[PDB]
Write a protein that binds this DNA or RNA. Sequence first.
RNA 1: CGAGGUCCCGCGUACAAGACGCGGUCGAUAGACUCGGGGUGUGCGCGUCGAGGUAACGAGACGUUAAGCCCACGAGCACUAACAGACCAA
RNA 2: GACACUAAGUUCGGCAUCAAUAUGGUGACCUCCCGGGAGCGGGGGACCACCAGGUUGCCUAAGGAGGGGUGAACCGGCCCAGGUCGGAAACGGAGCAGGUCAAAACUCCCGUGCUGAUCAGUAGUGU
Lengths: 81, 81, 107, 188, 109, 64
Amino acid sequence: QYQILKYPLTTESAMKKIEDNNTLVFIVDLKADKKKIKAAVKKMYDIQAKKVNTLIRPDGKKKAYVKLTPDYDALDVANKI
Amino acid sequence: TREYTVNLHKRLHGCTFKKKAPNAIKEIRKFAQKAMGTNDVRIDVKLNKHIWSSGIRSVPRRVRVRIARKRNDEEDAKEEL
Amino acid sequence: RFICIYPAYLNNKKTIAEGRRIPISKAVENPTATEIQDVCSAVGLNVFLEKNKMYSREWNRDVQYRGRVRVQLKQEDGSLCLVQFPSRKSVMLYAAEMIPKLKTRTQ
Amino acid sequence: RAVLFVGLCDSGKTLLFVRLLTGQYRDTQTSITDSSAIYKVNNNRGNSLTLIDLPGHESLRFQLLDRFKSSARAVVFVVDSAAFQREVKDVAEFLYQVLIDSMALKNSPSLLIACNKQDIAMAKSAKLIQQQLEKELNTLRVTRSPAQLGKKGKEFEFSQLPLKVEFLECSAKSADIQDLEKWLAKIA
Amino acid sequence: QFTLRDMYEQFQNIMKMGPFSQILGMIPGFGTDFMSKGNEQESMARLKKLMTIMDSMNDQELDSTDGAKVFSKQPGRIQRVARGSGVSTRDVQELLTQYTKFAQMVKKM
Amino acid sequence: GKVKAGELWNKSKDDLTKQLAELKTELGQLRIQKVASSGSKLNRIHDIRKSIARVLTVINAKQR
RNA sequence: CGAGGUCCCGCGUACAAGACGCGGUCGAUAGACUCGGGGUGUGCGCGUCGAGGUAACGAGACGUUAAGCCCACGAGCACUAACAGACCAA
RNA sequence: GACACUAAGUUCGGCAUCAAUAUGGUGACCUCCCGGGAGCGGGGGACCACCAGGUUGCCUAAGGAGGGGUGAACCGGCCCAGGUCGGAAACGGAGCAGGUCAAAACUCCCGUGCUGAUCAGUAGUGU
């Protein structure tokens, strides 16, 4: 069975999104969509997902931009990994 | 460092008229190279503008050029007067 | 109390001041402390090789160029070990002559 | 110390020299050697200077300027103001060497350009002679076939020189040498 | 531009501030076990030996934009430096390689 | 490797699940490290996957 | 063992390449500048006039102006560039 | 008037500037010994280069044993830090860097020899 989340995407752009818009970026698989990404994220990091935006690639994976609630706020969630 | 009157422009009539300006620029370079053995041929933009004043086709018959030699190796730096 | 024999002593490629002790006519190409010991030990001479010692007038630091050889001339009582070997010159020369014969050189 | 009078032939060196020493006129011929004499200055202390008149002939001018230059407290370069227009190039060329010689000296002598023969009608003014000489020395420092004149990138002018340089007008024919005796007093 | 003389000078400054060394151990921010043990005496003796090798070099080699290059084109120079400093040919090439790595990072600094 | 098939069958239904959720965690942390470049030891992040597969296979064979 | 020649440089009475011809400071070979000789047809600006229009404004006319602009020719003129130097040769 | 030729003048480079010797040095190289456990200590011959001031050849139109410089990564000589080598040590050796120099070499500037070029245009003679 395949897992939803693959690994965090760490990049300059992902950092700006974390710091300034408070979102988290992940590599998931291709067909997780989008609900599944939202749920998976919650249950893994104990947070409230407000929205998910998804893109196929190219990489052969899928990228999900997951924005969290303001009280969750995100710099911290990412710091523990 | 001395002031010199470049004809050789007269020679530029031996080339068709729509291209006299580039021929001019070459003649000035060769004039100052010659007389003036110790003279490299950097042409300050002022000279270029002088020749191109009435467009590519209508170069003057003469230009007065102020030129300077430094002595060692043979350079020359040359401008309009 | 043994004596000292540095390859510089037997080197025909060295000048006087560079450490040559025998006439060029008798000197040798590039004697190695090893070869020196190998010909001395094979004549009945008591000798040991000081592999790492280096001759003071030897600017080079390579191997073929270093080492020292020690031979016993007299015996504690005084008698020479081998009548045919009074002096040091005697050994140097004897060596200079026998090395160009070592199989390893005629090869 | 010595005051050297130099200049082209016929500029009036010997007559000025005579006028300064006697107040009179005298006939002269082209000079073939230098002549000298003591001059008591017009100021209170009345300092004495040794005026030295040097031949202007090309074959003698530099040989004698070299011989006396290190003894000079001052140099008076005499110019025929009436013949200036035709002689400009010859004047500038000689002055050039005089400027150079003067600067290469430990204690540079003070230098005057005496625009003589003003009594003649067609005489160019000292102002105009200075102007044309600057323009001319300006070309000479380039064409001249290491001490140099002023700054290479700026048009030559006497003020750029590491030397006291003055211009005045005069006439050796009594004469009109008031300013000259004033200057000689001033530099004594 | 990091020359061999520049490296020589940095080595002088580092050795100089070595003793000193007590005060440096009395300042926080250097993590746990700052300078313990104990390899500061041996480490400095090393820099000094490299300095003695550069003492056998000349001004051209020392002020060259790339001192390692001056020895690549004229390997005879390597032999001289080694003779004068009582060191081996390999030791001089080692210093040269180290200088190369040092200068690389200095421009990367 | 470090976890054999016999040992998986040895374990109780509850121990497989506990072992399962354990392997997942090791995996998740390996992927985090790999994020975030992972210190390691490639042979294991691969073994973690196969281990998990075996457990699931056994859970199925045994009926949980 | 140096007569001449090639290259070179500045140009053509020559010319598709090549060739040919001339000159190279003992110089007028080319350019610049000035003048001569030529082509157009009177410049910008300003002044007066101008049908008129309160005025603003105003096509245009005259004067300054044989002007202005221009030249692939000639002359004067070494100012600039023909430097520097190479090579072949019984 | 104008040109030539000899003598000759100015100037910047113009061109050019021996040979063989004694004595004492410095250096290099070779060759014999004595002493010594090494680094070495001690002593005799030979050759070459150069230097100091000193002769003479019968030597050239001139030719002085003049005064600087540089000394090269090493590749001239000295003094040689460090390090290196021999040594238990004392010391000694090879020696880079650095410094240095009557005495490797190479170069200038000086009287004297040739010698380009320059400027003068005088002295005579000739056309």
